[PDB]
Amino acid sequence: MKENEILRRELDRMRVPPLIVGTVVDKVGERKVVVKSSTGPSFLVNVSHFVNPDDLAPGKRVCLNQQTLTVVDVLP
Amino acid sequence: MKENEILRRELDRMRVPPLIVGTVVDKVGERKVVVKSSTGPSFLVNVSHFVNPDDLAPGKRVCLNQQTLTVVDVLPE
Amino acid sequence: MKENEILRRELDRMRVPPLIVGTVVDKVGERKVVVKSSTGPSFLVNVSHFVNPDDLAPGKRVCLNQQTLTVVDVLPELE
Amino acid sequence: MKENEILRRELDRMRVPPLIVGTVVDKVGERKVVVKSSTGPSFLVNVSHFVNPDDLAPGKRVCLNQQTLTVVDVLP
Amino acid sequence: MKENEILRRELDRMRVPPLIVGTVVDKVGERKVVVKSSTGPSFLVNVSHFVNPDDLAPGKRVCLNQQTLTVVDVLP
Amino acid sequence: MKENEILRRELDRMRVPPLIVGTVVDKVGERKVVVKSSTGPSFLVNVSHFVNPDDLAPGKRVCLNQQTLTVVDVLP
User: Fold this and answer.
1) CB contact under 8 A, F46 and E16
2) F touches C (3+ CB pairs < 8 Å)?
3) D70 contact residues in C (CB cutoff 8 A)
C-alpha cells in the first residue's frame, strides 16, 4: 500500500525529538560559546564541527542538542 | 493490511490529549517552526500534516505533542 | 471503624498523588478542554468520564491528575 | 504480628522533615484542602489525621509531605 | 608523591557535594526551622546537632544539605 | 608514575562542556564562594585551582561543573 509509506513518512517527521532553541551570549573559545537556553539557565557549550563558529555572534539564535546542549544549528 | 491500521493507530496516538499549548514564533521551513511552549522553553519542531502551514503565523496558538512537541493542531482563535 | 482500618485509610490518603489545580480556558471538543495550569503552562486535556462536561465553563477551577493532566474533578464555587 | 505498629511507623516516616511550606486557600471537603505551595502551583491535597481541620483556614501556613503534599502539620 | 598529592587534593576538593544556601524565616522547634530556599519554596527542616540553633535568626543565611535540606551551617 | 596523567585527565573532565553559568554572590573562604546558579538556587561551592580567587568578586560570572557545581572557570 502506497498509503502506508505516506503515513510512515508523516509519523517519522512527528517522532523525531525536537531541538531546544537558545541565544548566543558570547563566544569564549574557538569552539565554545555561552548560550542562554530558552529553558532558563545559561551554559558554556561546545559548537558541533558542522557549525561554523564565525556564523555565531551575541544575539544569534541557535539549536542545541538535548544532551550536551551542543550548538548544532543556527536559526535565521 | 494490519500495517495500515497500525500506522493510523500510531498517528492518532500522537494527537490525542494531553497536548501542550504553545505559540508560533516563526516558520523556518515549509514544515518546521520555532514554537514558544507554554511550558517555558522554545523549540524547533516539525509541523505535522494535520496542520496547514499557512495557518502558522507568529503569534498563532498551537497544540504540541507531549513527547516531541510536533505541531498537531492550531487552536480556535 | 477499626483502628487498623483507620490506619490503612490514612496511609492510602497520605500516599495518593495530589491533583494540580488549574483554570478552564475553554472546552474545545466533546470531552476536551484547554486548561491553564497553576504550575504555569496551558494544556488541551481530556475530561474524565466521571466529571460532568457541563460543569466546565471558562474560569471554572478544576483538578488535574498529575500523570495525564486529565480533568478528574471540579472545585466548588461561592454560595 | 505488628501490623498496627508497622502502619503507625510508616505514617510517622511521612511527617519527618524536610516538609514543604504552603498556604491554605480553602477547605473543600472533610479532609481535603486547596493549598498554594511555596513551590508555585496550587494543589488539591488530603489533610492527614495528624492535623485538626479546625486549625485549617484560608491563609493558614501548613507543612506538606515532600512527595504527595499531604498536609501533615500547621505552622504558628 | 608530592606532585600527585597536589592533584589528588584538588580532585578531592572539586568532588565534595555542594550545599544549598537559604535564608532563615523562623525557628519553629528546638531544632526545627523554616528556611526560604534559593531553590524557590520554603521548607521546614531539621537543624543538625552540630549547629547551635541559637545562631539561627530570621534573615540569617544557612547552608542546607542537598538531600534533607538539613541546616548544617549558618553563614557568618 | 603516570598516575599523575590519569589524575590530570580526571581534573580536565570536570571542566569540559556543558558547564553551568552562575554569578558569584560572595566569597566565603579563600576557596569557597556562594554562587547563584543560572538554574535558580544559590550554592556554597568550592573554587578549583583552575581559578584565581582574586578574580572572584560579587557579580563575576563563573562556569560550574554540572555534577558538583565547583567553579572551574571565570567568564571575562
Assistant:
1) yes
2) no
3) 13-14, 18
Domain ranges of chain E: 2-76
Residue type, F73: D
Residue D31, C-beta contacts closer than 8 angstroms, at least 6 positions apart = C13, D46, D47, D48, D49, D53
Q: Is the dihedral of CA C54, C57, C62, C66 positive or negative?
A: positive
Looking at chain D, the residues that come just before a C–N gap of over 2.5 A are none
Which residue is closest to C5 within chain D, CA to CA? D4
Quote the CA–CA distance of E63 and F68 in Å, as a whole number.
15
Residue of F66, B34, B69, F21 whose CA lies nearest to A22: B34
Contact D64, D72 (CB under 8 A): yes
Size of chain D, expressed as the number of residues it contains: 76
Question: Three cell numbers at C42?
Answer: 496551558
Establish whether chain A is in contact with chain B, requiring a minimum of 3 CB pairs below 8 angstroms: yes
**Cβ–Cβ < 8 Å for E22, E5:** no
Reading the block at residue C41, the C-alpha cell is: 503552562
Closest CA to C44 of E2, B74, D66, D38: B74
**E37 chain-F contacts, CB cut-off 8 A:** 41
Q: Which of 4-63 (E) contact D at CB < 8 A? A: 28, 32, 34, 36, 40-46
Q: Which residue among C11, C14, C21 sits closest to D43, beta carbon to beta carbon?
A: C21
Are the beta carbons of E21 and F34 separated by less than 8 Å?
Answer: yes
Give how far Cα A64 sits from Cα of A3, A49, A74, B70, Å.
34, 13, 9, 17
Eight-class DSSP state of F53: G
Q: Solving technique for this entry?
A: X-ray
Per DSSP, the residues of A2-68 read: HHHHHHHHHHHHHHSPPEEEEEEEEEEETTEEEEEETTSSEEEEEB-TTS-GGG--TT-EEEE-TTT
What span, in angstroms and rounded, lies between the C-alpha atoms of E39 and E20?
A: 8
C-alpha cell read off for C40: 504555569
- Cα–Cα distance between B16 and B12 in angstroms, integer? 6
E46: which chain D residues are within 8 Å (Cβ-Cβ)? 17-18
